[PDB]
Write a protein that binds this ligand. Structure first.
Ligand code: CLA
Ligand code: CLA
Ligand code: CLA
Ligand code: CLA
Ligand code: CLA
Ligand code: CLA
Ligand code: CLA
Ligand SMILES: CCCCCCCCCCCCCCCCCC(=O)OC[C@H](CO[C@@H]1O[C@H](CO)[C@H](O)[C@H](O)[C@H]1O)OC(=O)CCCCCCCCCCCCCCCCC
Ligand SMILES: CCCCCCCCCCCCCCCC(=O)OC[C@H](COP(=O)(O)OC[C@@H](O)CO)OC(=O)CCCCCCCCCCCCCCC
Ligand SMILES: CC1=C(/C=C/C(C)=C/C=C/C(C)=C\C=C\C=C(C)\C=C\C=C(C)\C=C\C2=C(C)CCCC2(C)C)C(C)(C)CCC1
Ligand SMILES: CC1=C(C/C=C(\C)CCC[C@H](C)CCC[C@H](C)CCCC(C)C)C(=O)c2ccccc2C1=O
Ligand code: SF4
Lengths: 143, 73, 124, 41, 740, 35, 80, 165
């Protein structure tokens, strides 16, 4: 949004037991994703990595090994309770990257502040044949 | 090859000898065919008939042909 | 993350603590020697029992012992291959490259020693 | 009546009717002409 | 609290919705535009959970559908009884059951199929039936065709009554949701009335009707000269002559001197030497004891009178320290989710069908049933396959419940939540167990085949080289052979002849004999355990990963039945729980095929045969001890040594079995094009055919489309199962009829 | 010319055990070769 | 990773972004459509190629196209 | 006597096969009393077999070396040896019936498209219209070649749905 929020590792995790489909060795070798939300009350939700957990009244922090799990939890919280969460990506060296609300308004909106990239300005089916682009390393859809 | 050249009707061609330490003694005895000293495979590729037709008769001719083809390769 | 009574048992914890792989109190050569001794001694077992020469007395134990030695050598070759092809890039010395090479050398030394010990025990 | 007729006008029902009609015609032809092979008037 | 709650006329009986095919769902209510709609019409027909979100309407539809299935079953039973009444030689079979084959289906002479009406004996022509209905009617005291006619008419009347009952209980008087949710009343009425009262009624029929008719039939008198069952019912002189304890006239029952009933309520465990079946007095006391036990069990739950047990209280009370909330939210799950109850019912029904098959080949509970080898083989195979289908449908509907009816709010730390919480460990351990079993069984078979082909019979895992004898099964067999000796002294003999004893034969054919267990039996039993373990692993992975997984975290939002999630993450084809059930269906088929092959070979080699003065000469000469240890033995001594009757059946009454064998091979082969391939190829082929019909202006208004990927998988697995099942059916029946 | 009688006792174990073993060793080092 | 390409036939209906399970697409202002929205892929390195965006496209043919190739840890959907 | 084959009446293997079939039918018949329904059923089967074997003979059918009759498919050769009734006449009859089916289906496809929701008429058939088109298809080749003449049988390549190259 106006200012990118900074994650807090001291935020309380939701009330949950032990997960089996949790973070593997990739969490301590490669990047892992961390989802934060602000629950106004305590309620039971379903994690994508196992059974069910109970979120605490306040900030809530969860860890996952895949971005798809983070976005699945985000859309579950948005559809079920309208929570509007946000997840960061933390690498092995501790670098933190802001992932979901890039402009803080969610990708469903526009905000008139994002530059559209990887947009072909020609119609589909007007691309050149693969014979035209041969021994060049450029795909017909990449021009 | 020479025995098949002498009698192309009765005795069967031999493809290659079998040396398998996993073979048992009845299996070794059962695979001794065509008047061989060990377990052999009956040839079905038909190179015996072809090499008899083109004029090869002796084993030395096959030896020199094989070494010449190895040199060619 | 899911703690269990059998994984977090203190008896299981101290049984896995003093194992040669998880001791972290000795050089990799000694751990390899112990590993090779134990695994060669157990691997000689099925070879002196059900080999192709098991009906022939005397020669069955010898044939099983050389087969166990060959299996130990194959396992040592695969251990050396894993050490060379795993730790070729950047506190436990076992996870290092030359540490794993010394572990493999200890493993094959222990394997042949255990095969000889099993031969002595079967002869006696 | 017309709702039941439109139910009978559905594709599986008329297909079933065609099935019984054709099967009965062929069966009665085979019964009253036992095992013919060549058209000989 | 428990009371009848019924709404009066919620649905009007009008044909206006019969005209519209797609009406139960709003997706199909708009009308058809492509051909995939039509399949969607025949796929979501019974998906009542998707038509409406109201549980009351779903429960009413379930009640009506159950009434319809009972009406269909009663129609089929009445038709079976009618075919036995008119187009059958049951009266001829009653005179000599050991020489006239049971026949109840007669064909019409139309195109040369009259050769299928074989010479079954007794001056009759027809198809030799393997259902065993003749033995069931002989066990029920049925003598004349008039009784079969009356049973058929009563079955038709009860089928019409049940069909009207379904119409009434749906359209006229529809029960409410509170009526269906009274699980305590349902369990009490089912234990006491559905099972116990029926058991007591069948016991009374066996005492008053079946036992005297069976005793007179075993005496050898003419069935026409046998007195009618009502003569036994009313007049007490014949029943006193046949059983002196009937002269007391209900005195020992109400004076607690039940030992006086020992003449016609016996405990002579074993086989009747006259007929090779179970003793009817033993079955009478059995059904009486079962009725007493079920009437006792039916007064367990509290419904309206204070006393009883509460299912919710029992489930909440049984909580341990290692399980957290032990069985906490299961009562709410099983009272709101139809699919959980469907999974439970299907699992228990399939397991009980397997039990029925095993304990029916073991003890033949019918007169002249064990002599008919074909009837026993067909019944065992049929119950085996129905049990397998039911237990795979249990996993299917459990996965459906997991996708649809699971609520995380009611499952926080209960047993289902912990099972989901360690499903990965469950699947990993089951995978390791399955791999180890498959190695140490199939690799043993490959080892035997290799060392046989290498000329090392002493290196094989056979009954002569390496004795891997089933010491536990042999010890259990020896203990159960001594069960009447020391632990059950009131039994006259052993509970079955499989444990040990002597050979019981009827008409020169062996009815039952002790079954020896060797290394081949251990190998095939461990092979069966391995196949069951793999199928369990597949279905459990489908059930537990139906909602989410590491590969797909939002699988619950995709539904239970979806083809894939695209080629992403390397490819997500066949990732749904439906596809897991579709994969496990083949493994169930393979498991049960190996099981029935083991049964057929073992009972043909070591059980069935003829009995001469020298001894018992079996059908295959007991090759199972020396041929079942290798795959080539099954290939040659079981599949090639047999199946010669099927291929040589042409020109005889068994030629329909050969034709059905060829058609089954055809359907099994035709299934592979749906099992393999995909959808885009057939879609473009259909596009080319659309162009062809558009050139001739015969393009249909309904756009033809290729079958869906899920639909294509369903068609492939259905045709594959049908082809394999009919292949085994034709081969088994032809082999067991020609040489049996 | 004619190979000796011990050639099946040497070449067959060489191309059945030793040569595939060294081939798999070279291939395993080539697969996991990193920069 | 995979290549996500969006053409000018998009009507800005935002269905592809809602169908995206990894937050790859976005909506930018545009003038070539009535809704004044255009789909973009600024996070194509996180796309796995599930083709869920192509299912939600209402236009004939496809206004968004996913081309697989050069799979990585993020592109293969691996938690390990 | 074409293709080195003999007529069924002149052949010996044909009579041997008929004798074998009569022998096995009589063997099946001898196990039943004459006053029983299986006896009449087997007698009817034997009579049908004898009638079929008589009708296959004296009808131009010929069999080679096995007694099983053979069919000649080439026109002209079948015309000059009275074998046209084997396949030549039945193939023309099947072509007539198949053209009847195609013309009836084409008429129903065309006649049910100039109305609202033609798929509804496709899925719920207009039974009087279907029967009317059923009884109007007796002159299918005339109407087919007339539609070919006026060009309404075939659609032009401009109004036809076509796949991209
Ligand atoms: C596609 C190949 C093919 C062909 C060319 C034939 C052709 C024939 N078969 Mg065969 N048949 C086939 C497939 C085929 N059938 C299949 C797949 C099966 C298994 C289901 C059978 C099973 C079968 C039996 C069991 C019998 C035949 C008979 C016949 C005759 C037709 C009798 C009939 O329908 O009444 C004639 C009907 C008409 C001419 C219709 C007229 C309608 C209007 C008037 C025009 C004819 C020689 C019968 C026969 O006579 O044997 C020689 C016979 O007994 N076939
Ligand atoms: C002791 C009383 C009694 C008896 C005998 C039954 C018997 C049956 N119930 Mg039922 N049930 C009962 C009480 C009883 N119920 C109560 C009190 C409740 C409410 C809590 C239910 C709720 C219930 C549900 C929700 C369902 C059943 C179903 C069934 C059938 C199970 C299928 C089967 O085994 O086929 C056995 C079949 C036969 C033996 C054939 C003859 C069946 C006759 C016609 C039934 C006669 C018993 C009947 C209950 C008498 C009262 C009806 C009367 C007004 C005419 C079976 C007919 C299932 C069903 O719908 O099946 C149709 C089902 O899904 N039951
Ligand atoms: C459901 C099973 C069943 C059934 C139907 C019967 C039925 C019968 N048994 Mg059996 N029996 C059974 C189980 C059964 N038993 C079991 C489990 C045992 C244990 C071993 C026995 C042991 C046994 C022995 C040892 C004997 C019988 C006998 C009898 C008969 C005597 C009936 C009697 O006095 O009972 C009591 C019956 C009643 C009180 C009648 C019921 C009340 C009526 C129906 C009221 C009708 C009122 C109505 C509104 C008015 C008429 C309407 C009209 C005007 C339209 C009867 C045919 C005896 C026999 O055959 O001799 C005759 C005999 O010797 N049975
Ligand atoms: C106790 C019995 C029972 C009951 C009440 C249900 C009820 C249900 N099941 Mg379940 N199921 C069962 C047993 C049962 N099933 C078993 C035993 C299996 C394993 C085989 C399955 C496997 C299964 C799957 C995989 C699925 C269901 C689904 C469903 C739902 C809709 C079914 C439907 O619309 O089919 C409509 C009817 C048909 C499609 C016709 C099927 C015909 C088959 C494929 C071929 C028949 C071959 C026949 C025997 C021989 C024909 C030969 C030919 C020459 C004529 C419904 C909740 C579906 C669902 O969405 O659940 C909510 C679903 O996806 N079930
Ligand atoms: C005969 C063919 C065949 C074989 C061997 C396998 C083997 C396997 N499948 Mg199966 N499968 C098959 C057909 C087959 N499948 C078909 C047709 C289907 C379609 C329905 C499936 C569907 C299927 C599913 C759905 C699943 C499996 C699983 C498994 C594994 C179980 C492991 C096990 O218990 O056995 C151990 C393996 C063997 C006994 C292989 C036999 C070969 C010999 C004995 C082993 C040693 C060979 C040799 C000595 C070593 C050579 C070394 C070198 C020269 C190469 C294993 C990899 C399951 C799995 O992943 O694991 C649990 C699983 O979930 N398969
Ligand atoms: C492979 C397993 C197996 C099977 C199928 C049998 C089967 C049999 N045995 Mg055998 N037995 C076995 C293993 C087995 N046994 C091992 C031993 C050594 C300890 C014995 C020792 C043994 C003796 C000493 C005797 C038998 C006898 C019998 C017969 C009757 C047994 C009986 O009444 O059971 C009970 C029958 C039932 C139908 C009960 C089924 C209950 C169902 C499944 C629900 C159970 C729920 C359960 C209570 C809940 C679990 C509670 C738990 C958490 C505490 C029967 C043929 C007797 C005999 O000779 O036959 C006459 C006999 O005297 N057995
Ligand atoms: C392309 C397919 C085909 C083939 C391979 C044959 C093959 C044959 N035809 Mg046939 N023919 C065909 C189609 C075919 N016919 C058609 C469609 C017709 C028109 C209805 C005829 C009309 C015809 C006549 C009128 C005669 C042959 C004859 C012959 C034979 C010799 C032909 C020749 O040139 O000398 C030969 C068996 C001749 C024959 O029987 O041998 C003398 C002969 O007289 N054919
Ligand atoms: C009232 C009265 O007499 O109704 C007598 C009933 C209905 O009688 C009439 O029915 C009409 C529809 O056909 C309308 O509903 C009328 O309102 C109704 O009075 O007549 C019957 O024949 C009863 C139904 C018999 C068939 C029941 C099948 C149920 C499904 C089982 C599968
Ligand atoms: C082989 C399969 C082994 C599964 C081991 C875990 C079982 C599941 C598990 O955790 O069970 C734990 C269970 C003890 O748990 P509780 O006594 O707390 O369970 C009580 C509630 O089930 C009510 O132990 C057993 O059942 C012993 C036998 C296991 C077999
Ligand atoms: C004589 C004969 C023969 C021969 C034949 C021939 C040789 C033929 C040819 C043929 C040809 C060479 C053909 C061609 C064709 C082409 C085309 C191009 C076509 C078209 C068609 C159409 C278009 C159709 C249509 C239709 C339909 C389908 C439906 C409706 C109706 C109609 C008819 C219209 C044989 C020996 C075999 C057998 C015997 C007889
Ligand atoms: C062949 C095939 C198709 C094409 C199959 C189609 C379109 C289904 C065709 C069904 C027909 C129309 C059934 C009726 C057939 C006869 C016309 C009816 C009987 C006629 C006689 C009574 C005369 C798929 O769509 C497919 C999809 C997914 C995986 C595999 C496959 C696959 O293998
Ligand atoms: S789904 Fe298609 S039309 Fe809609 S916003 Fe995305 S690219 Fe544009």
């Amino acid at each position: 949004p106006w200012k990118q929020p900074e994650l807090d590792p001291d935020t309380p995790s939701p009330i949950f037991g032990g997960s089996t489909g949790g973070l593997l060795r990739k969490a301590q070798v490669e990047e892992f994703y961390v989802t934060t939300w602000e629950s106004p009350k305590e309620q039971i939700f379903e994690m994508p990595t196992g059974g069910a957990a109970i979120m605490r009244k306040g900030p809530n922090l969860l860890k996952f090994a895949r971005k798809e799990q983070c976005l699945a939890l985000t859309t579950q919280l948005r559809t079920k309770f309208k929570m509007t969460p946000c997840f960061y990506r933390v690498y092995a060296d501790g670098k933190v990257e802001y992932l979901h609300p890039k402009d803080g308004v969610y990708p469903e909106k526009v905000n008139a502040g994002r530059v559209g990239v990887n947009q072909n300005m020609r119609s589909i089916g007007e691309n050149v044949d693969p014979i035209k682009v041969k021994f060049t390393g450029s795909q017909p859809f990449t021009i | 090859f020479e025995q098949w050249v002498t009698d192309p009707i009765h005795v069967r061609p031999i493809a290659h000898a079998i040396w398998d330490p996993h073979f048992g003694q009845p299996a070794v005895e059962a695979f001794t065919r065509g008047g061989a000293s060990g377990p052999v495979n009956i040839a079905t590729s038909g190179v015996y008939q072809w090499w008899y037709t083109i004029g090869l008769r002796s084993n030395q001719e096959l030896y020199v042909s094989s070494v010449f083809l190895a040199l060619v390769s | 993350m899911l703690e269990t009574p059998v994984t977090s048992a203190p008896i299981v914890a101290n049984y896995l603590s003093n194992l040669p792989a998880y001791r972290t109190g000795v050089a990799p050569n000694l751990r390899g020697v112990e590993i090779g001794l134990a695994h060669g001694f157990l691997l000689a077992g099925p070879f002196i029992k059900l080999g192709p020469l098991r009906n022939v007395p005397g020669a069955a134990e010898v044939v099983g012992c050389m087969s166990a030695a060959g299996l130990v050598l194959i396992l040592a070759l695969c251990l050396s291959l894993y050490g060379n092809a795993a730790f070729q890039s950047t506190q436990d010395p076992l996870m290092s490259s030359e540490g794993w090479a010394k572990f493999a050398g200890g493993f094959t030394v222990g394997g042949l020693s255990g095969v000889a010990w099993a031969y002595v025990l079967t002869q006696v | 009546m017309k709702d039941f007729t439109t139910y009978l006008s559905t594709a599986p029902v008329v297909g079933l009717g065609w099935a019984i009609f054709t099967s009965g015609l062929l069966i009665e032809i085979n019964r009253f002409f036992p095992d013919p092979l060549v058209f000989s008037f | 609290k428990v009371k009848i709650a019924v709404d009066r006329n919620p649905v009007e009986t009008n044909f206006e919705k019969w005209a519209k095919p797609g009406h139960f769902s709003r997706a199909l209510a708009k009308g058809p535009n492509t051909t995939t709609w039509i399949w969607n019409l025949h796929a979501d027909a019974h998906d009542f959970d998707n038509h409406t979100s109201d549980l009351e309407e779903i429960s009413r539809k379930v009640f009506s559908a159950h009434f319809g299935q009972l009406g269909i079953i009663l129609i089929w039973l009445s038709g079976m009884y009618f075919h036995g009444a008119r187009f059958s030689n049951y009266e001829g079979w009653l005179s000599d059951p050991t020489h006239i084959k049971p026949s109840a289906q007669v064909v019409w002479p139309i195109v040369g199929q009259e050769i299928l009406n074989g010479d079954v004996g007794g001056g009759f022509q027809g198809i030799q039936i393997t259902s065993g209905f003749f033995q069931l009617w002989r066990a029920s005291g049925i003598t004349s065709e008039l009784q079969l006619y009356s049973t058929a008419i009563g079955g038709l009347v009860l089928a019409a009554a049940c069909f009207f009952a379904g119409w009434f209980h749906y359209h006229k008087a529809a029960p409410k949701l509170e009526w269906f949710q009274n699980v305590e009343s349902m369990l009490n009425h089912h234990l006491a009335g559905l099972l116990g009262l029926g058991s007591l009624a069948w016991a009374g029929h066996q005492i008053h009707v079946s036992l005297p008719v069976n005793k007179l039939l075993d005496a050898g008198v003419d069935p026409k000269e046998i007195p009618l069952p009502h003569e036994f019912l009313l007049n007490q002189s014949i029943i006193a002559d046949l059983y002196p304890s009937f002269s007391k006239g209900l005195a020992p029952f109400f004076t607690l001197n039940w030992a006086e009933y020992s003449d016609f309520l016996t405990f002579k465990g074993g086989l009747n030497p006259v007929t090779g079946g179970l003793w009817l007095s033993d079955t009478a006391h059995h059904h009486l004891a079962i009725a007493v036990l079920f009437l006792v069990a039916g007064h367990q739950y509290r419904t309206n009178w204070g006393i009883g047990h509460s299912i919710k209280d029992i489930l909440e009370s049984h909580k341990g320290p290692f399980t957290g909330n032990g069985h906490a939210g299961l009562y709410e799950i099983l009272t709101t989710s139809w699919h959980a109850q469907l999974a439970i019912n299907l699992a228990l029904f399939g397991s009980l069908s397997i039990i029925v098959a095993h304990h029916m080949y073991a003890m033949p509970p019918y007169p002249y049933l064990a002599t008919d080898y074909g009837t026993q083989l067909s019944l065992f195979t049929h119950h085996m396959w129905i049990g397998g289908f039911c237990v795979v449908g249990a996993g299917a509907h459990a996965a459906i419940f997991m996708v649809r009816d699971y609520d995380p709010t009611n499952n926080y730390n209960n047993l289902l939540d912990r099972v989901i919480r360690h499903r990965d460990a469950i699947i990993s351990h089951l995978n390791w167990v399955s791999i180890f079993l498959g190695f140490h069984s199939f690799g043993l078979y490959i080892h035997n085949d290799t060392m046989s082909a290498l000329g090392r019979p002493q290196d094989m895992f056979s009954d002569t080289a390496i004795q891997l004898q089933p010491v536990f099964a042999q010890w259990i067999q020896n203990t159960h052979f001594t069960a009447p000796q020391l632990t059950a002294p009131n039994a006259l003999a052993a509970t079955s002849l499989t444990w040990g004893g002597d050979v019981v034969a009827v008409g020169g054919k062996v009815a039952m004999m002790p079954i020896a267990l060797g290394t081949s039996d251990f190998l095939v039993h461990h092979i069966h355990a391995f196949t069951i373990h793999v199928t369990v692993l597949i279905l459990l992975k489908g059930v537990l990963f139906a909602r989410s997984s590491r590969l797909i975290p939002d699988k619950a939002n995709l539904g239970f039945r979806f083809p894939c999630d695209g080629p992403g993450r390397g490819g997500t084809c066949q990732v749904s729980a439906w596809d897991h059930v579709f994969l496990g269906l083949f493994w169930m088929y393979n498991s049960l095929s190996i099981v029935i092959f083991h049964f057929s070979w073992k009972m043909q080699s070591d059980v069935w045969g003829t009995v001469t003065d020298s001894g018992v000469s079996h059908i295959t000469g007991g090759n199972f001890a020396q041929s079942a240890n290798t795959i080539n033995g099954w290939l040659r001594d079981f599949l090639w040594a047999q199946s010669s009757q099927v291929i040589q059946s042409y020109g005889s009454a068994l030629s329909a079995y050969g034709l059905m064998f060829l058609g089954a091979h055809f359907v099994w082969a035709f299934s592979l094009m749906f099992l393999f391939s995909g959808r885009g190829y057939w879609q473009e082929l259909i596009e080319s055919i659309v162009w062809a019909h558009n050139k001739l202006r015969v393009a249909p208004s309904i756009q033809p489309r290729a079958l869906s990927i899920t639909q294509g998988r369903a068609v492939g697995v259905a045709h594959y199962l049908l082809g394999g099942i009919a292949t085994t059916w034709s081969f088994f029946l032809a082999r067991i009829i020609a040489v049996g | 010319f004619v190979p000796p009688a011990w050639a099946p006792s040497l070449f067959v174990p060489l191309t059945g055990l030793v040569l595939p073993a060294i081939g798999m060793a070279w291939a395993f080092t080539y697969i996991q070769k990193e920069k | 990773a995979h290549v996500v390409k969006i053409y000018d036939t998009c009507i800005g209906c935002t269905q592809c972004v809602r169908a995206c399970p990894l937050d790859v697409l976005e909506m930018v202002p545009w003038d070539g459509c009535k809704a004044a929205q255009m789909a973009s892929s600024p996070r194509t390195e996180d796309c796995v190629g599930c083709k869920r965006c192509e299912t939600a496209c209402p236009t004939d043919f496809l206004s968004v196209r996913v081309y697989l190739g050069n799979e990585s840890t993020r592109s293969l959907g691996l938690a390990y | 006597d074409v293709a080195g084959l003999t007529p069924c009446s002149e052949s010996k293997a044909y009579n041997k096969l008929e004798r074998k079939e009569l022998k096995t039918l009589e063997k099946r018949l001898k196990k039943y009393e004459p006053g029983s329904a299986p006896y009449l059923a087997l007698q009817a089967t034997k009579e049908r077999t004898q009638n079929r074997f008589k009708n296959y003979a004296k009808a131009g059918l010929l069999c080679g070396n096995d007694g099983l009759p053979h069919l000649i498919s080439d026109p002209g050769l079948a015309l000059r040896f009275n074998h046209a009734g084997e396949v030549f006449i039945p193939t023309f009859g099947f072509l007539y019936v198949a053209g009847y089916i195609g013309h009836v289906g084409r008429q129903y496809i065309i006649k049910s498209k100039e109305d609202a929701k033609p798929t509804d008429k496709e899925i719920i058939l207009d039974v009087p219209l279907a029967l009317q088109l059923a009884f109007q298809g007796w002159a299918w080749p005339l109407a087919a070649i007339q539609e070919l003449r006026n060009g309404s049988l075939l659609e032009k390549d401009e109004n036809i749905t076509v796949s991209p190259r």
